[PDB]
Amino acid sequence: MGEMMIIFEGDDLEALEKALKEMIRQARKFAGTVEYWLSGNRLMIRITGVPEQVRKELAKEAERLKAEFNIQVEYQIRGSGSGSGSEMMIIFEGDDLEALEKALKEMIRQARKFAGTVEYWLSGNRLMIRITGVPEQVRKELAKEAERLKAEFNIQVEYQIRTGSLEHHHHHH
Amino acid sequence: MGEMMIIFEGDDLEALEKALKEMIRQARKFAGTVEYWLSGNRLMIRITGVPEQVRKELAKEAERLKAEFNIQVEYQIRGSGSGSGSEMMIIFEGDDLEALEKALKEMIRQARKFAGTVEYWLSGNRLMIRITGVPEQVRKELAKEAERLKAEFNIQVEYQIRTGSLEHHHHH
Ligand SMILES: CCCC[P+](CCCC)(CCCC)CCCC
Numbered sequence: 001m002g003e004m005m006i007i008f009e010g011d012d013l014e015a016l017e018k019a020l021k022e023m024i025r026q027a028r029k030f031a032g033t034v035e036y037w038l039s040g041n042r043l044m045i046r047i048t049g050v051p052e053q054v055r056k057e058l059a060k061e062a063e064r065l066k067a068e069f070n071i072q073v074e075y076q077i078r079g080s081g082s083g084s085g086s087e088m089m090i091i092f093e094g095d096d097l098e099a100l101e102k103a104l105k106e107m108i109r110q111a112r113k114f115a116g117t118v119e120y121w122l123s124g125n126r127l128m129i130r131i132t133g134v135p136e137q138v139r140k141e142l143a144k145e146a147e148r149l150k151a152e153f154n155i156q157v158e159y160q161i162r163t164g165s166l167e168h169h170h171h172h173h
Numbered sequence: 174m175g176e177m178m179i180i181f182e183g184d185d186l187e188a189l190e191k192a193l194k195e196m197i198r199q200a201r202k203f204a205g206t207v208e209y210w211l212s213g214n215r216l217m218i219r220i221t222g223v224p225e226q227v228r229k230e231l232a233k234e235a236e237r238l239k240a241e242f243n244i245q246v247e248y249q250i251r252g253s254g255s256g257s258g259s260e261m262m263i264i265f266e267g268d269d270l271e272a273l274e275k276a277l278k279e280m281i282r283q284a285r286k287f288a289g290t291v292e293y294w295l296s297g298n299r300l301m302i303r304i305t306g307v308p309e310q311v312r313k314e315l316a317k318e319a320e321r322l323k324a325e326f327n328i329q330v331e332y333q334i335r336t337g338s339l340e341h342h343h344h345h
Contacts, residue, residue: 005297034211035210035211035212035213036210036211037208037209037210037211038207038208038209038210039208039262040208040262040333040335040340041340041342076297118295119294119295119296119297120294120295121292121293121294121295122291122292122293122294123292124292169184169214170184171184171185172184
């Protein structure tokens with residue numbers, strides 16, 4: 001297990017999407033889970049559930065795509081958390097921006113206080129906070145704080161929880 | 174100048190990515206300024222620079238893709254037909270989290286001062302800020318502020334400006 005951020009940049013949209021197609025084919029081949037986002041001339045690809053040697057191989061693939069499609073490539077790695085696979089995600093919603101950003105400040109100081117690392121995204125009236133590397137007891141407290149901020153600033157809250165880092169997709173036919 | 178947000182949801186990743194391919198082909202076929210983001214089983218497609226009648230047509234296309242690939246579809250719409258928009262993306266990088274978040278606060282204070290709307294994303298050592306609703310003179314000012322913040326907090330900065338169709342990238 002490990003995370004990897006790969007960034008493709010190029011002015012040719014078609015070549016960029018050809019590189020995407022191949023990169024995520026390689027990642028999925030090594031049992032990677034890919035997240036990606038295309039905006040303008042930039043393509044960002046987040047690959048999770050991949051150990052060290054797999055990341056080394058995917059890096060090789062990224063370097064090869066750089067030559068084949070004439071694009072710029074940069075990649076970054078966690079790189080190696082000692083212990084990991086303990087995740088929580090919180091979503092705040094409200095029409096008051098000022099209150100939302102107060103909630104953000106309190107939640108991430110709290111999360112960092114319990115030695116958790118945060119990622120957050122504010123867009124419109126929706127604020128998303130992702131907290132990783134956080135065990136069961138900590139999530140219980142962070143949930144309390146979420147409920148505290150919920151009541152205090154009169155905003156909406158919802159949660160999604162990952163505990164095993166094993167992801168199950170169900171298909172019905 | 175109106176925009177549009179289309180969201181695809183489905184359990185079949187391959188079918189989901191087929192729907193994406195067809196949707197953005199249609200979106201690009203018209204006016205079509207396309208941005209998209211895939212995460213888990215949810216796919217978000219953001220379309221800008223599309224007038225009233227085009228957005229109506231793209232909605233029909235999405236409903237058709239729903240039937241063809243057996244996926245869930247929801248979409249939201251905004252507009253319409255204006256000169257501004259005028260979009261700005263700024264990127265801060267640095268090893269000092271406290272300094273990054275200080276730069277964030279100053280940057281969004283300025284943008285909101287000039288009646289601009291901000292969206293931002295912090296992950297690891299990278300901070301990205303999308304600023305909308307800001308005309309050319311304002312973007313030049315926000316660009317100066319970005320360069321000022323570079324020196325003060327000792328962080329890496331680059332900004333890009335999109336008006337069309339035409340997008341300008343500035344590197345430091
Ligand atoms: C590496 C994927 C990042 C996707 P975004 C942030 C989501 C975080 C969970 C891009 C941030 C804009 C500033 C979602 C925007 C795409 C429509």
